Design an enzyme around this catalytic site. Structure first.
Site, PDB file in Angstrom:
ATOM      1  CD  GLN A 294      -6.215  -5.003  -1.984  1.00 55.44           C
ATOM      2  OE1 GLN A 294      -5.771  -4.729  -0.870  1.00 55.44           O
ATOM      3  NE2 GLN A 294      -5.593  -4.662  -3.106  1.00 55.44           N
TER       4      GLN A 294
ATOM      5  CB  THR B   7      -0.891   0.072   1.259  1.00 55.07           C
ATOM      6  OG1 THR B   7      -1.675  -1.124   1.368  1.00 55.07           O
ATOM      7  CG2 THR B   7      -1.821   1.287   1.192  1.00 55.07           C
TER       8      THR B   7
ATOM      9  CB  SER C 106     -10.044  -1.399   2.551  1.00 50.26           C
ATOM     10  OG  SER C 106      -8.785  -0.746   2.589  1.00 50.26           O
TER      11      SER C 106
HETATM   12  C1  LIG Z   1      -1.750  -1.697   2.573  1.00 46.89           C
HETATM   13  O1  LIG Z   1      -1.646  -1.004   3.708  1.00 46.89           O
HETATM   14  C2  LIG Z   1      -3.148  -2.400   2.248  1.00 46.89           C
HETATM   15  C3  LIG Z   1      -3.890  -2.980   3.436  1.00 46.89           C
HETATM   16  C4  LIG Z   1      -5.137  -3.791   3.073  1.00 46.89           C
HETATM   17  N1  LIG Z   1      -4.996  -4.400   1.751  1.00 46.89           N
HETATM   18  C5  LIG Z   1      -6.379  -2.908   3.157  1.00 46.89           C
HETATM   19  O2  LIG Z   1      -6.636  -2.384   4.261  1.00 46.89           O
HETATM   20  O3  LIG Z   1      -6.887  -2.525   2.084  1.00 46.89           O
END
Ligand SMILES: *C(=O)CC[C@H](N)C(=O)O
Lengths: 359, 190
Positions: B40, B1, B72
């Site tokens: 994901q 991310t 998320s």
């Molecule tokens: C990166 O911090 C993504 C974390 C995870 N996939 C989400 O919370 O979307």
């Protein structure tokens, strides 16, 4: 709340200052791309999209065209909105798809197999935002990234280190990936030049044909085939059916400041507002940063939030999220009253809250 | 991310957090597109009560389903002061995103720290399960002793997050800060 500080000469840490525009990102090149777009007359959304495309090239660790995310936009006139471009599970996805024959989750399937992927939303999200809130055409904001992919850029410490540390676990295990990120049997090293010809073609076709190239065009074909040949689920239908969605931000008020963040499918906005609501009941300023009491209060507040997260949060288009109750100040007060500044409550004694009286 | 923030000359602001999920995602490129594919799907609850890669758990609400968007923790955030955009922030970190952003807000509002001070300050985190108060280096041994005495299960772990933030002065002056936790990052303007 006490007075705010924008920073003075006596401070240890100094912010970067600017009078016109500013961009903050994880990558120097991407940041400079954004700043250049602003200098060329693009607005915040134009620059944001340009930075997003640039990071998809210079920061393959997270910047992407094959993933998803969220965007918070606030116009100079106060209009605040959220763009949800989170991946959608394939139409063929099923509840127990990641369980092994014994019924236990298989992290390999959900993290490293072709089944681990959701239909990408980044391209759709950026176009939704650019088309409605931007001012420049897509080809213009994609061009910087295109050139970086076509002509290449120098691998820095961050990318070299990540390729070695995290990349080694997955990149060399796929021929096409290894052909791009590996060199002479090892991950690209600092000082090496990374050229991404295929990504450059993908970017050029998106710039020329619009987001449809990704969801219905050659790129969609390439994704579908990659899936079909390797036990993946994403189909041309999934890609054609994907849609980014503009949603109302989740927000709250903390000591007179209004906080705006992401609403479901994200849990971020709700829990940040919920926790702030809890903290508002304490004189945080008095305790101060790094104090055992401040940390105690916040750690405790966080427990209740994450407990609620495990039970009430999900895609709002599929489940009704009790966001009103979760961000209700009376509910927050009931939680704050359970916080003992001198004694932590084991997580084993904490369950999702009973929201009925707050709905 | 990864998260990035933008503020233009007119005062418009944008906060973006997007990701492949884990670093490089699946590590799978889609054919000859040169595009890496996300992992994901691990953000869904694979089975009630079993934690995912970030130690997060779920049940029916976040169960895997066709066409469903996995839950998320991403939190691009904007704080308003005196009716004007004042803080634009966000960060990566999986489950830790919530607490990292929370600390940026608390540091700014309650502790009156400038954006750089707030960014460079140490972070702590508790996500219910596992039951541990995660901390970065930077907290006083005296303070950690008091926390443990309160019953907290303090655990010193790796750095958390990568905030990329911009604070806006009421006069229009922009103040920014890139996280020291990420080498080669940058905040710049004109
Ligand atoms: C990166 O911090 C993504 C974390 C995870 N996939 C989400 O919370 O979307």
């Amino acid at each position: 709340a006490p007075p705010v500080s924008y920073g003075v000469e006596e401070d240890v840490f100094h912010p970067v200052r600017a009078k016109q525009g500013m961009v903050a990102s994880v990558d120097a090149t991407a940041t400079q791309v954004g700043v250049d777009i602003l200098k060329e007359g693009g607005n915040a959304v134009d620059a944001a999209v340009a930075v997003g495309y640039a990071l998809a090239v210079t920061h393959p660790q997270a910047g992407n065209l094959g993933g998803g995310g969220f965007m918070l936009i606030r116009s100079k006139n106060g209009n605040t909105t959220a763009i949800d471009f989170r991946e959608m599970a394939p139409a063929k996805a099923t509840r127990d798809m990641f369980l092994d024959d014994q019924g236990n989750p298989d992290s390999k399937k959900s993290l490293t197999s072709h089944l681990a992927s959701g239909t990408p939303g980044t391209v759709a999200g950026f176009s939704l935002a650019l088309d409605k809130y931007g001012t420049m055409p897509l080809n213009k904001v994609v061009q910087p990234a295109f050139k970086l992919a076509r002509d290449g850029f120098i691998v820095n410490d961050a990318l070299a280190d990540d390729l070695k540390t995290y990349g080694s676990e997955v990149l060399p295990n796929h021929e096409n990936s290894k052909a791009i990120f590996w060199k002479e049997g090892e991950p690209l090293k600092k000082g090496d030049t990374l050229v991404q010809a295929n990504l450059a073609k993908s970017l050029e076709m998106i710039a020329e044909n619009g987001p449809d190239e990704f969801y219905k065009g050659t790129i969609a074909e390439q994704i579908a085939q990659e899936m079909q040949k390797n036990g993946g689920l994403i189909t041309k239908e999934d890609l054609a059916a994907y849609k980014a969605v503009e949603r109302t931000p989740i927000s709250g008020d903390y000591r007179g400041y209004q906080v705006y963040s992401m609403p479901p499918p994200s849990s971020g906005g709700i829990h940040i507002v919920q926790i702030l609501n809890i903290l508002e009941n304490f004189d945080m300023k008095k305790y101060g940063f790094g104090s055992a009491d401040a940390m105690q209060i916040m750690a405790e507040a966080e427990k209740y939030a994450y407990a609620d997260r495990s039970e009430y949060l999900g895609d709002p288009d599929f489940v009704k999220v009790p966001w009103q109750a979760l961000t209700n100040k009376a509910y927050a007060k009931s939680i704050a009253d359970q916080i003992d500044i001198n004694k932590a409550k084991p997580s084993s004694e904490i369950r999702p809250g009973k929201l009925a009286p707050y709905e | 991310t990864t998260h990035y923030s933008v503020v233009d000359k007119d005062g418009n602001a944008v906060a973006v957090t997007y990701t492949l999920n884990t670093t490089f995602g699946t590590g799978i490129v889609a054919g000859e597109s040169g595009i890496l594919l996300n992992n994901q799907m691990d953000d869904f609850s694979a089975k009630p009560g079993v934690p995912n890669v970030y130690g997060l758990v779920g049940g029916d609400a976040n169960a895997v389903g066709p066409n469903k968007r996995p839950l998320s923790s991403m939190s691009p955030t904007i704080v308003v002061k005196d009716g004007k955009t004042w803080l634009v922030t966000g960060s990566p970190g999986g489950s830790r995103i919530i607490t990292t952003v929370l600390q940026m807000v608390v540091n700014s509002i309650d502790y009156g720290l400038n954006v750089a001070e707030a960014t460079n300050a140490p972070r702590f985190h508790h996500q219910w399960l596992p039951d541990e108060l995660r901390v970065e280096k930077g907290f006083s041994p005296d303070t950690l002793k008091l926390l443990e005495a309160k019953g907290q299960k303090v655990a010193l772990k790796e750095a958390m997050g990568s905030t990329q933030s911009i604070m806006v002065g009421p006069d229009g002056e922009l103040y920014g800060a890139s996280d020291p936790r990420s080498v080669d990052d940058l905040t710049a303007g004109y």
